[PDB]
Every structure is written in C-alpha cells, then in structure tokens.
Amino acid sequence: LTYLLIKNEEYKKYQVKKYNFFSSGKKMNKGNIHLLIRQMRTFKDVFVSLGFEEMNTHNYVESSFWCFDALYIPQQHPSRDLQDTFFIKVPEMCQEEFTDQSYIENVKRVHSVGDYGSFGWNYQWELKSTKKNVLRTHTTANSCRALFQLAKEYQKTGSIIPKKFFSIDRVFRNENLDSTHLAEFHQVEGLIIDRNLGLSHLIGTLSAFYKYIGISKLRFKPTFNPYTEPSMEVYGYHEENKKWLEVGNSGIFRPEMLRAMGFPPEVSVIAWGLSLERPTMIKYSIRNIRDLFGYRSVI
Amino acid sequence: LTYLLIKNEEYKKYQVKKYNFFSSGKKMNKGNIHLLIRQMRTFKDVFVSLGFEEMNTHNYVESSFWCFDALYIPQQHPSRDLQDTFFIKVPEMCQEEFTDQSYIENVKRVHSVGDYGSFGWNYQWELKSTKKNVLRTHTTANSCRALFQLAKEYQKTGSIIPKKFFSIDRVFRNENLDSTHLAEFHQVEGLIIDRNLGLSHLIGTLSAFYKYIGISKLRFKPTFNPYTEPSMEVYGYHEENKKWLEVGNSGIFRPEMLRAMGFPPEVSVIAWGLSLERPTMIKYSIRNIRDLFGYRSVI
Amino acid sequence: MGPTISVHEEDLIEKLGEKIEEEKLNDICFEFGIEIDDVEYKKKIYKIEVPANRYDLVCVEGLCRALKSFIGKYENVSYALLTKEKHFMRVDESVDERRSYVVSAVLKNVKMNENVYNNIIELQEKLHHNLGKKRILLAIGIHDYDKINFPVAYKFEEKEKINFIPLNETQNVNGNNFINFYQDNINLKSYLKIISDFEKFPVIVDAGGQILSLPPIINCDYTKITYDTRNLFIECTAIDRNKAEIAVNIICSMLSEYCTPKYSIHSFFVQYDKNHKGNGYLYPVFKNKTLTCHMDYVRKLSGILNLSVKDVEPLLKKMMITSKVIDSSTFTVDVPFYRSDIMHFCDIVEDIAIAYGYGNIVSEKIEIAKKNSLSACTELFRNVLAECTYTEVMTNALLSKRENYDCMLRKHRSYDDRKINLDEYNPLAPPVQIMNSKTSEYEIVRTSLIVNMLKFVSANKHRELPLRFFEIGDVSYTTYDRTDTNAVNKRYLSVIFADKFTAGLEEAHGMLETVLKEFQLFSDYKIEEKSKENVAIRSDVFYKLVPKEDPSFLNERVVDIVLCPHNLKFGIMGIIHPKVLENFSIDIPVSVIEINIETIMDVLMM
Amino acid sequence: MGPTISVHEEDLIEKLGEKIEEEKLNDICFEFGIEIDDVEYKKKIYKIEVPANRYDLVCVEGLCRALKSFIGKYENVSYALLTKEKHFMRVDESVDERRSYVVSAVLKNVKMNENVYNNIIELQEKLHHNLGKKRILLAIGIHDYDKINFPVAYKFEEKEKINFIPLNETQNVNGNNFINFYQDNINLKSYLKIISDFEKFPVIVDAGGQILSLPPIINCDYTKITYDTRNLFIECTAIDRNKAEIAVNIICSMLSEYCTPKYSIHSFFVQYDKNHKGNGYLYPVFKNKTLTCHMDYVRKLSGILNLSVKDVEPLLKKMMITSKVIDSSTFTVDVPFYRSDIMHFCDIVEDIAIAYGYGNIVSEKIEIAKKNSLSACTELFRNVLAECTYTEVMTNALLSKRENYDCMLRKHRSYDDRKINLDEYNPLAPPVQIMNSKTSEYEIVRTSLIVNMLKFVSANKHRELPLRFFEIGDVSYTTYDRTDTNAVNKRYLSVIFADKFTAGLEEAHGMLETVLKEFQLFSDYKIEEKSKENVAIRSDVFYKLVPKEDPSFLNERVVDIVLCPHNLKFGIMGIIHPKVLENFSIDIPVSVIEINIETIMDVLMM
Ligand SMILES: COC[C@@H]1[C@H](c2ccc(C#Cc3ccccc3)cc2)[C@@H]2CN(C(=O)Nc3ccc(OC4CC4)cc3)C[C@@H](O)[C@@H](O)CN12
Ligand SMILES: COC[C@@H]1[C@H](c2ccc(C#Cc3ccccc3)cc2)[C@@H]2CN(C(=O)Nc3ccc(OC4CC4)cc3)C[C@@H](O)[C@@H](O)CN12
Ligand SMILES: [Mg+2]
Ligand SMILES: [Mg+2]
C-alpha cells in the first residue's frame, strides 16, 4: 500500500498494490486571499509601477463639503438626495470650522455668484447643508482633501511639484435591497497634478494603465461629470473575449474646484476612476455579485 | 474543558475548568517564503517602484566575452584565473560567431591597440580565451548583454530612449570550502541609460534606493573597478544600530565598454550593485551564512 | 445615469437631412456623447440618453438641430422677442417664500397637431422630472392662450375660496377638499401632500377669478391642450427664479420652430408686489454671455497640438455655437441661452474637443516598463505552496557526479543524444561540468532539484514530522549547437514530503493537483469527473499521469506528468526508492514532485 | 580585494609634513580611496590597502608624495635620464617566446641603508606578487652595479653549462640539478617547476660568464644587496615587454629620490638579435602622453555643476598631476608615466572628482513616492493568515442595531462616555447611525467584525469543518469633538474558527501567538519561557492575556489582549457564548480573535 519506517531492508518480500493515479489525491486545505483583494493588489501593482502614491482614505463618514461642495457639485443635485445617498443621522453634522474659512468662502463664492472666470451656479449656497455627514459616495472626496493639502502646502512653499496619487477603497450608495446594484463597492481612483495638462496626457496614462491589464485598444466617449470638464467615458477592447467594454470614467477637474483651493490656472489635474468589483467578476467569471462579496460569498 | 455539538441548551449544568491562558496555544504549522526571497522581493519592490525593468539573467554559464572582454576587463586580470573563477570544462567553449563579428572586432581593437580616445591595454587580445565558458562571477555580464542589445536596436531606430534595468540573480566564486566566503551568492544590480549622466545622478538614485530601505545618510569612497570610471564604494548609516556600513558598489561604465557597443559619447550608463545575502542576515540577525542558505539551513 | 428620451422612429425627418441609419448614427452619438439605449415598438420607438446638464437636448427638437449641426450646417437660428401692455402677471404679498417666482410666456399663432401635442407633454414631463426634480423646484403649465382673460396673477389664496373644474373632472372641487380628492391619484398623490401643505394654496388665476393651475398637476379643464389651439400661454411656478427662466426659455425656444411665424414667441412681464422683493422681470430674457478665450489655454487643455483660430470657427458650429476670430491669440464665442451648461472657458474647450473627435487627439505615448514573466510565474508558485504550509528551501547549484547519479542509482544521457527536447523536463540531460573547483564536491551544476532536497531531508529527519519542503530554482545542462554558450538554464520546482509512517503518494498527488488547479490546469481525470457532473472545466489543454518505472523510485509508484495535447513530459512524481533513501541516509519514507515550470507556463492562467 | 601594504608607524616622516594622526588621516584616505586596514607591532606597523591599478602606490615612497600632494604641495618632480656606451644588454636567438623581454636600469651613486634595503625588497615582492602576478609575467632582480662586468646578456642556455653560487648557498649548483635543488624550498618551490621546464634555462649573465639570475628567485650570491652598495643595477625579465617597462620605471622612479644625486637614474639599451624581433629599446622610456579634455564632458560626467578651467589646475595637483589651461572650453593635462592606470579622459575626471571630494557633489535629489503604512501592515497580516490555511472573507459594513447588540446580548457605550481611548480596541464604542437607509437592515456602520463572521459561519455551517475564516477591514464609530467629522475609522482583524466537537481555545490562542510572532511581538509567557532557556526574545514591548468576563463569551474562556508597557487593550479572544450561537443560528462551537491592528502597528517589526 505505502512505505513505512520499518520497510527499509525488508520491503523486497511484499505486494505493492497498484495505485490508481487516474484519480485525485488527498484534498489539501489552504488559505486564500480574497479574490477582490487579489484584484486590488494587481491594480495597486499597476499604480505603484507608474510611480503613483497612495492617498489616505481611512474613513467612511464624509462631510458634504468634501464629498460635494468642494468638488463644485451643487447642493440641489440628485446625488445629494436621500434616495441616492446614505445621510448620517447621529454624527449628523461635522465640526464647524472644518478646514479653512478662506476655502469655505471661496467655495460659497464660486457656487453662488461665480468667480475665477466661471459664471458659478447662480443659486445661494447654504453652509448648513455643507456640514451634513454622509457615507461617502465616491473616494473623489479624499482626492479633493489631498489636492487641497498639496495646494495649501505649495502656496507656502511657492513651488508646484508634480505628483501622482491613487486610492482603492469602499464607498456606499443607497441602492435597493433587490440587488439592482450594490449598496457598497470599492472604487479605484488615480490622478496626476502638474502644469498645463490636458486630454492628451489623460489618454497617455490611460492606455498605459489599461494595457497593463491587457487592453491594448481604447476608445473615448464624451460624457458628463460635474467635477470634470472635459470628461470621457472610456471603453477598451477585451482580447480574450468578443467585445469592447466600458472600463472606466475620467476627465480634467474643473477650475472652480481647483482654483478655489489656491491653484493658479497653470496647475491642472487629470483623473480617472473605475470599479474593483467588475474586473474581479470578469477575470474569475463570477456570475452575480452576491457570490463574491457579502455574507453569502463562499468560494 | 471545551464546548461540543451536544452542549447547546445543556451546557449550564457543568464544570468549566480554568484555562491557563498564561501559556502558548496549539502549535500551528504554516508555510514560509525563504528569508532570502523575502529580501529579494523587498529589493524588487524598491526597483519596480523607481520605474526599473528587470533584465534577463536566465543562465549560469557565461562566455568570457560577456563576463570579461565586453566589460573591458583584460584577459590577464586576476578575476580570469582559475583560482578565483569556476571555468567550465565539458561545455568549455561557446559557439564561434557569438554575437556580432563587428562587436568582437571593436573589443579586440580597444583591448589591444586602443580606440575611442582610449589608449587601450597594449597587450594582444586572443579570441581563443574570450570563448572559454565560466560560471558567471557577476550579473554585470547580463547587463552588458542587455546594454548591447539596446545599442544594436537604437542604432537601427536612430533614437536613444532612456531606460532603467535591474537584476537579482545567483553568481559563483571559487572560494574555498572553509567558509571564508561563499561559493554562491545572489547579486542585485541596477543601471540607468540616457544622455550625459554622471555622479550627481548616481548619488541621486543611490540615496533614493537606499532611503527606501531605511538608510537616509550616505557617504562615498573612491575605489577601483575595471568596468566603471569613476567608481565609488557606498557607505550608509544604519539607524536601528550603532554604525555605518558598506552597503554597495557603483560607478559610471567606461567608454571602452559602451562605445565598443555602438553608443555615441552622448550616451552614458550609471550602475550599482550589492549583495542580497548581507541585508538578509542583518535584518533577521542571522549569525553565519550557513544558517540561512544551503543544505543545513533549517529555520 | 442620464435621462432616457423616448422619441419615435418614424421620427427621422428632414431635420435629419440624410435619414442615415443605425450604424453611422452610432459612431455619431459615440463621437457626440449620446448612447442609443434601446428601440421598442407600440412602431419601433428609439429611447436614447443625453447629458444631464444640456437641458436643450431633452426634447426631440433640441436633439434634431444639435445633431444636425454636428455635421450638416450651423443654420444660425433666429429669435424674435416682441412686445408688457396687453398680457402680464402679478405676484402677491401672499406669494411668500415657499414658492416665490412665476415666469410666463406667450407663443402666438401656433401650429397645432395631436402628436405634436404628445411632443409637448413629453417635454413637460421631462423638464418636470429631472431639471425640476419631480416638480419639487418647478411646475410647468400649458394653457390655451385664448381662454385666459388677461391680466393674470399668482397668489396664495384661502382654500375655501378656491373652486375650479380640473382637467380630470366635470365637477367642481373646493380647496378644502383638494388633497383628499387627489390623495389617491396614482399619477399625482406623490406631489400633492408633500409639496403643498401651507395655510393657503398657490394658484395662478386670471382677472375673471378663474383658477387655472396649482403645484399639483391638475389645471383647469377649460384651458386644456387640444388640437385647434391657435396659440399658447405657458406659466411656470417655482422656488428658483433662474431655473424657471431656463425652463420656459427651453419650452418656447423649442416649439417656436413649429408655430407658423416660426421662431417667434411673444413676451410677458412679472412685477412683484411691494412686500415679498418688489421688482420685476421682462420674460423672455435671452441674453448671450459672450465669453472670450485665449489661444494657449485651449490647446494645452484640449491637447489639440498644432491648430489655430482659423480652424476653430468651423468646430463650434457642429455643436450649434457661433464663433469668430479676434486675433491669432484670442477668440470670440457667444454662449447661446441654449447652453445653460457652460460656465467656463473649459466648457467651450470640451465642445471643441468633441467637435474634433475623441478618436483624433494624438496620445502622449507614455513608455511603460514590461515585466519578466518567468519571475511572475515562479512567485505565484511560491505563494500557492506557502499557503499549503510548505516551507521554501534554497540549495547549492553545484554537486558531485557521485551524488547526482550513483547514489540516485542512474546514469546521465549521452552528450550526442538528439531526442532531448529543450521544452521538456530533462532531469538526466547531459550536465555542465566544472574544470577547476577548488572544492572537491563541486563537479557539475545540478540538473534536478530532487537530490539536494534528499540531502536536506536527511539533514532534518531528526526534526518534527512530517517534513513539507519545496524548492523552486534554476537547473543547467549542456546543449551543444542549440544555445550560444552550448549550455542552458531551466526553472524547476520540486516538492518533497516525508513522514515516519507514509510516503504521501496521496498528499503529493493532491499537492500537484492543487498547485496546478490554482492556474486552471486540470487533470484529465478531473475533467472527466466534473463533466459527468455536467460542469465546464478548462478542457482545451490539460495534463495526465503516465505510469512508468524509474531506477530511483519504488516500482508501480512513480509517474510522468504530461502536458496535452502538446504531449510533452514536464514533471515526475512518486515514491522514492528505499535503496536511494539508504544512499542519502534517510530513515523515513519520502515522496517527491518535480516539474519544469517553463513547459506549462504559456498555458497557465494568471 | 586590493593589495595590503605593510608600512611602518615610525613611518611618518617629514614627507608627511604635518605628522597628522589617525583620525584625520582616516577622512583623508576615505576622501582619497584608501582604507587603513590594520595596525600591528613587531612597533605598530600600519597595513593599508591601495587601488589595484595605481602601481605607483605599492611602496611607501609612492604613497608619501601622492598623499602629500593631496593637500600639501604639487612639488613638480624632477627626472634626469642620462646616457648606451658603457652599460647595455643583448637578447639571444635563444630567448624565444617563453620569456622574451628584458628591461634594465642603472641607479648610479645611491644612498644605502639596511631598512631602506627592507624597503626595496618589500617593493620587489609587491610588484612580483600583484602586477607581476606571482612572478608569472615578470621577475625583478636587484644587483649591485659594481660587481657585474658589463656588457650583459640574456639567453636560454644549456643546463649543463649553468653553474653559480646562489644567494642561498656557498656551494655551486649545476643547471641539471637546479629544480631538484630548490624543489622543496618553502618560498620558491612554487615558481620553479611550473614557470620553467624548458629545454634550456633562462639566465642573465655578464661578459665574464657569471650567471647573475634566473626566473626562480635565486640570483648569484655575489651581487647581493647589502648596505654599502654604492649604486645598483636592476634587471627585469618578462613575457610582456610593456609591464616590464612599467615595473622598472616604478622601481628606479621610486628610489631615485633616495640616491644622493636625487631623482636621477642612468639608462640602458636592449638590442634583440636578428632572430627572435631584431629591434631595440632605450630604457628608461618615460614619455608623457598629454591627453587634452573638453570642458563640457568633465562637468557633465563629474556632475560638478558650475566651475571652470581656472578651478581645475589646482585640483589635479592634489593627485600629483600637472595641469594647464588652453581655453575656457579646453584643458591640457600630461599623464605622468607614474599613472599607468589612465587610459581615457574619464580617468582624469575620476581624479578631479576625488580632488573635489565625494562629499561635495550636490545630489540630484530624486523625489520618491512614500507608501502608506497601514496598507503595508494589513497585507502582511493577510499573508501570514493565508499561510496557516485561513481563508479571507469580506462582509457588509452596514448592519442593524438588533444584530450588533441584542443578538450579541450587549448594549453599546454612551455617546457622552469620556473614558473611550481612540488608540484602543473599542468594539462597543457608540456607533455611526444612518438616517435614510432604503433597506431596513442598514441602521449603523459596524463597530466589530465578529458579528458578520458569526453570520458567515451560520451561512456555511453545512460546509466541511473546521471553518477557518478571517476578515480584516475598517470599523467606524462616533467620536464627538475628536475628529473633524465627529466619526472615525479603525482597522480591525477578526479570525473565526468553528468545529463540531471543539471551540478551538487552543488553536485561536496559537493563531494569535503565531500571527504576532511573525511581527516579533511575543506573549509575556513566551518571554519568560524562552528566557528561562536563556534566550533573548524581543522583550522591550509585549502583550498579555487578561481574563475577564463578557456577555457574548462563555465564562472563564475569554481574554483581553493588552499591549505592554503602554497598557492598552487591543483585542479580545475567547469562546463564543452558546446563547449567541443560538441567536445567530450556529449549531457548532465557535472561537474568535479580534484585534485593532492600529494599536500595535508602531511596535510591529516588518
Ligand atoms: C456608479 O457606478 C459606476 C460603476 C463603477 C465606477 C464607474 C466610474 C467611476 C469613476 C470615476 C471618476 C471619474 C473621474 C474622476 C474621478 C473618478 C468609479 C466607479 C464601474 C466602472 N466600470 C468598471 O469598473 N468596469 C470595468 C473596469 C475595468 C475593467 O478592466 C478590464 C477587465 C479587465 C473591466 C470593467 C465601468 C462599468 O463597469 C460600469 O458599468 C460601472 N461603473
Ligand atoms: C565580492 O563580494 C562583494 C560583496 C557583495 C557585492 C559587492 C559589490 C557588488 C557590486 C557591484 C557593481 C558595481 C558597479 C556596477 C555594477 C555592479 C555586488 C555584490 C557585498 C556588497 N555589500 C553588501 O551587499 N552589503 C550590504 C548591502 C546592503 C545593505 O542594506 C542595508 C541593511 C539594509 C546592507 C549591507 C557590501 C558588503 O557587504 C561587502 O562586504 C560585500 N560585498
Ligand atoms: Mg459639457
Ligand atoms: Mg582611477
């Protein structure tokens, strides 16, 4: 059947039954990084490879100032409505005198009466709404925090140092319980800050990024984002399967967003974002979302 | 003692002996990446982070042309002597018409009668010795292969594209069996190729590299290498311990090496190299080499 | 995201000019920013989606001319804001701040139809739902002009004085039975109870006391919209003055073209009472804003490379913008009131980019650093074995001919052997031999990993069992006339198991299966088994276990692992022979797997 | 690497000029390229190491003036190559190609000493050993001038005609007993049998038939080197003409300074016979090569930034080079025959860099991208758990107050609680509460991972046991007046074990120990145990297991994990209470570990 501690110098006089190798062996138990975390690593590898620095996104609660108002999204936008957003109840409002009053002033000014060459939005901005805590709808929020801190530090330093930032983290949407979409999901964001950038640079780093995951051909559709003009939906051709897919969204951040921060018109930021879940369930051929993540996600 | 499948709705009427938590638990068995491979990963992470591309070093046999003659090391150098080098016996010689006869011609010309502004070595070069296979003494060999291929391709293209290369791989020395040093060890090499480089750039990327492993202060000693003029021994200050250490070697490759390849004097290459073993046994406080690697290397 | 327009398919008119069909309409919308969502009959309606911010694309008419200009012609549109004396409206102290503003408009001498009537109400619902955000910020009402005795007013009146015959009914409805009346209207219960729960109710009413409308969609039945309505009066009541402005400008703008003095709407004035504001507003406004850009910004942002202002004037025309040149380094655009979405020079740049075509901006071409794949593959192998609690090992690349062959009870292949395939696993290939080892035990480079871990196991047989090691590294052998050095390296993985009571012919087998399964490469047995359970396994390539004998392995217990359909031997796995356990001083049974991870690499999935 | 010079310590002379002592000599050598290897008496010899390629630094005299110039003075050296008529040497048809060349030199009127004599022979051995590569390419011989009747010759003579009294003996030695005679000389057996095994033996011999030397170190005893040797003749016989040239130039160069007409050696001519070559050579050669550099190369290569040729002339002087300016964009250096190591403009650049000081080139300052540490730490935790065969899990961040508290048999802390420490593990901290979940079960953000994996275990209790999961992710809770949002996130890790017959109070404990051990953070029990075995464990910080009770854990079987000396609770571990296994529909025992990996992060070692 099988050798033993005793059967050396005495194994010759016995029967070695056939072993049916047309079979499987003993089942082995082994540990597993979650599929979603493997996807997250691969993306993070791509990002560190292109020289990018991870941003801090260690938070789920966000004030609407960072999530909406500092991105130059108006307060009467469907993204700021209860139906589509988890608003926070008990820690309902953030601290007064969050960030800097000068920045808050710039944001109110541009939102209401225009500034920086922009016409504005021609409503009257309310500080009261800006302080309502939500579960962040995107990590674009933390990117805006980071953009503001590097504005505030380069105003003191006087120097505009080019930089590259990425984040991968969970965000929340008040979708239904009938699995139309997901209540939670992870978002991948990257951006670059320097002097005089534009869609040529976006398409460069975009095709870089995306070939790095096996999509050599890209196409670009104009679409709308309130924080990014111009903006383009990104499609890419999946080699191993038949068709083109929607793989990302991106654009150039608006002047009202950045210049409110302190940046001069020289400075521009290019940014893009995409899901983690969709790559995952495509690569591993996962049918529906609830077989990956959540309490009923075995194997 | 411990709960059971039967003791839910019937656990209340029993004795729960004390558990001595002032103890260790069940010993767990777990798998291990080799310490040397962990060190190798960390270095490789540092390298991919600075944008570097791994070279091919998939070989242990090297012709002396690539190991010695193309690096502009003379044939009557102590590195090419039996005492310090494993020469190959059965596959003793490589193929005639290895690489290109023009390159071989350039190397003989510079070694013997000088060229490219160099005086040369004023001996008479022998094609016979250049074809003797060895176990490679360094991976500088494969770096020279790669430098030659990018020369040969940029001559056709006409364009000098800046690039960065690293390798981590085993090399061999005919040291003794009395553990003076090691017969085998892994070498880490990096280099950069572009226009008009020099020691300022070397010290830049060097302090980059080395802070990335927790050595913020560097010092530099002139020393000698036959393939690198100028060249500097690199010392770095180890924070967590008392003293400065020798941590690397480096310099700028000689014109006789590169220009023989095809490069114009515009092109220069900066390069550095270091051990894998020494970081490993410092980080993990390994006493002597034979407790890490080799047949008697448990734990 | 985005609002889905339901337009027709008979839809395609002259307006289109070409009646170009689906396939080039598709690259036209892609190049423009629209996705054609669906087509579905009731025959063959086209539901499309448009930007949420270009409210001048929420009706078929606003699309028609936009997409028309996108290629066809600018067709510099004509307006005519006549008139203030015969037709006005006033806003009462009553109006307050719960719903402050009203904006009115008079489209005189209007063409009438019954599916142009469908057109109108589709437009009204669209602006109600998105811009007006389900009527929460504005409500629009369409009244026949002629049935409303001017002037008109907008107040918050006591509900007991409110009585009118809504569009729904023939029977009057008092204010104080109003909510209760529509409380269960499927279409309107929504709006009703929330929007309005004031002490007084908001009404727009003519000088004849005739209630004409409210916040809740009901309006009087008397000013109904029906064909043979010669001309129209529109009111829009709202909490935001500006968005109501934009609302009515869109409405009268977009059906001016289909009233018989085409592209002409008559105008109204709204004068608030002393207490509220106190001011007034002359609708329609219709101001252009005429921002002027600088020539460096537009190409640096748009990444348009080399092009100048003589190339710009045609580009905006395709987006329905009017354009003229000031200077090589200056522009002069006027925003159409159309484009409420333009707040900055960058919105013009966006439109110029779209007019240019997102497929025609030349890329930065950012040079990336490729990554060696062999390293990649072996690191995945390392991880998958560490996760089964195997410990990695690293041995000497040099050994003695005595260790590799004699103790292994075998002899190496000939140096003139021509059956040797460089893609296969070649443990007894002819070795690389050293001339001058200064250490006697260093005769050759290893050609198999198994010997060194046999040494290792012997080293640690005292330790705690089972022993579960693996090594993964380079082998070398002689290849005359096939490499430039006549030698080659290969990358092997060996997995050794040892235990007092068993050689794991079951666990090594399972380990090989598990390791390869990680890369979606399966046994043939596995593929048969799971397809009898009617499951689709990766079948196009696989591996099999071929029983053979081997000097170094206990008989009937060693196997070649063979890649199919290539038919290439790439590993071995079995029990180690007791004699060679003696030779290597090993007093416990031992099982082994070795594979050449370079054979299978290209079929592995990672 | 490198050759170790053994110089004295009384050594320090005037030559030095300052007699500066060890500490600044050290930064001088570091700045120069030398490492001071050791000091050891016989009193206090200084053994140093010098570049292998600057053969003009292999004797004390060559160092002295080099390091002297390095700071002190250039001291532009003087030569004087007199004379060809009275003192020559000829090379025979015999000489062949096994050892072809000889180079001779005559240092006339020389100072003599007995430790200058030590100096000489130390020099001779050094050049023999490294440049000459253990005499395999050149052999040097020092003969008193006067005892050699000129002219002299170099031949391959029949061994039966070779007879002379070597330095060793007083008794003659024939050629055909030569090897056998020295075959067991400790110092020389090496050289002998290998170098020379020709039919004839190579001798240098004067016109009086007197054998003076050979390849094997023995020379005639008659021309010994001993004090009161007025002046010296040197021969150097070698297979490479050039390296012999460089050899003797070094020798007579470096002791010219200590013959009384200082810095002057007399010269010789060597005329090969018709058959061999046929040519001749006038030693010493002593040519300067005078390469001239261009001003862009030197700063682009040396990275010297802004500096011009007026700054260059002083810099080379410190290296003992002579320097003059041609032009703002041109140089004129002459190589001293000294510097045999200079083949290219870059060797001058190297020396200019050294003269500049490697500590004084301003760095590129290449801006690197820092990396988040929390990600780093959690990925290490992931790997160390995967390697024990635990499977990673990812749950919902939102749940119900009913799941977190009631089913867990507990209530959360107060919103006015001021004992709450943000660095600790705070499972019942006051939660973050949602206003409008559109899904009833989403009342709060989770504050502990344990509940969701209790749900998970319930989900998979049908699956194969044991279950070994872990999750590692963010928790949130309310922190009024302590963050800018009044909420905070923490990063927790929870490890759940479940099995039919046991709650693993032993395996969870071992898992915690193993996981923390990976980061060299140990139990206090561990530290006691392994220090009783007299082992040094990381002791400066550690953790302990504090028994407490918990509503949700079976009594006497749950523990606080506490970081010391900080005294901060950072996890919990124990058996789950049967009642809450009922509440969560779990019919098998379950054990748990949860820790806040942000408390221990800064003491973890990675
Ligand atoms: C609201 O839901 C949006 C979600 C999610 C998404 C979309 C956009 C962003 C963004 C952004 C952004 C834009 C500008 C600046 C900053 C951030 C983030 C997430 C995915 C984004 N999408 C997405 O990930 N799809 C995708 C992405 C990559 C990919 O890789 C190839 C397989 C190898 C494959 C698929 C696109 C679609 O899946 C889309 O259906 C759904 N999108
Ligand atoms: C022949 O043996 C040389 C070996 C090995 C080495 C040295 C130089 C090179 C090189 C090179 C080179 C130079 C120029 C161009 C290309 C390659 C390669 C290996 C280590 C190189 N050395 C070495 O690794 N030491 C070292 C390096 C890094 C390090 O990191 C800090 C702990 C965190 C710590 C120690 C230096 C010394 O250990 C030295 O004693 C031994 N050197
Ligand atoms: Mg737009
Ligand atoms: Mg030098």
Residue numbers in the entry:
A (entry chain A), B (entry chain A): 271 to 569
C (entry chain B), D (entry chain B): 0 to 41, 44 to 84, 92 to 284, 288 to 617
What does the paper behind this entry write?
Aminoacyl-tRNA synthetases (aaRSs) activate amino acids as aminoacyl adenylates (AA-AMP), and enable their relay to the 3′-ends of cognate tRNAs as feed for ribosomes. In both P. falciparum and P. vivax, FRSs exist as heterodimers of alpha (α) and beta (β) subunits that further dimerize to form a complex of (αβ)24. It was demonstrated that these compounds exert their antimalarial activity via inhibition of Plasmodium falciparum cytosolic phenylalanyl-tRNA synthetase (cFRS), an enzyme essential for protein synthesis.
Toward unravelling the structural basis of the protein–inhibitor interaction, we crystallized the PvcFRS-BRD1389 complex and obtained crystals that diffracted to 3 Å. Our final PvcFRS-BRD1389 atomic model contains 905 residues- 299:α subunit, 606:β subunit, one Mg2+, and one ligand (BRD1389). The N-terminal domain (residues 1–270) of the α subunit was absent in the crystal and no electron density was observed for it. The diarylacetylene moiety of BRD1389 that occupies the L-Phe site is recognized via a bed of β-strand residues Ala541-Trp542-Gly543-Leu544, while its edge phenyl ring is covered by Tyr497 where it provides an aromatic T-shaped π…π interaction at a distance of ~4.2 Å. The urea/groove interactions are mainly stabilized by hydrophobic contacts, particularly from Pro549 and His508 while residues Val517, Ile483 and Pro549 provide sandwich support to the cyclopropoxy moiety. In particular, the flexing of Arg548 likely opens the entry point of auxiliary pocket for 4-cyclopropoxyphenyl accommodation, underscoring the induced-fit nature of BRD1389 interaction with PvcFRS. Additionally, in the PvcFRS:BRD1389 complex there are two noticeable, ordered loop conformations in proximity to BRD1389 binding site within the PA1 domain: (1) a left-hand outward displacement (open conformation) of residues 443–453 (loop 1, in ATP binding pocket), and (2) a left-hand inward movement (closed) of residues 507–515 (loop 2, in auxiliary pocket).
